[PDB]
Structure 1
């Protein structure tokens, strides 16, 4: 065979930067709950939005929002 090329730069799959208890939602009293951000309009509650500078997208429906909140 002929020799291989070798530019240099290699790109690996990102490790993701995992995190737990992360870090939305709150409770002031104890019993009741006080949701932060919002839940999904399309799917049922339990799934939450993603808050950026006037841009949102969900996870269960890959990336399907548009309107602000």
Structure 2
């Protein structure tokens, strides 16, 4: 057979940078809750917006926002 080419640069699947008990949401009083950012208009509450410099999206609908918030 013919020899393999060998440029060098390999690309692996990203490990994702997992993070839980994320700093979204808050509570001040104790009794009631204070939501941070916002929930989805398309789907029901529980899902939360992605916040960037005048650009939003959500993951349950893979990524489908446009309007600011």
Settle same-fold status: TM greater than 0.5. Answer: yes
Q: Which consecutive aligned stretches of 4+ in structure 1 deviate over 3 angstroms post-superposition? A: none
Q: CA deviation at 1:13?
A: 0.2
Normalised to the residue count of structure 1, the TM-score between the two structures is: 0.98
Q: CA deviation at 1:23?
A: 1.4
Q: Structure 2: any 5+ residue segments left out of the alignment? A: none
Aligned length: 69
Q: Which structure dedicates a bigger proportion of its chain to strand?
A: 2
Q: Structure 1: any 5+ residue segments left out of the alignment? A: none
Distance in 2 separating the partners of 1:18 and 1:4: 36
Q: CA deviation at 1:18?
A: 0.3
Q: What value does the CA root-mean-square deviation take over the aligned residues?
A: 0.4
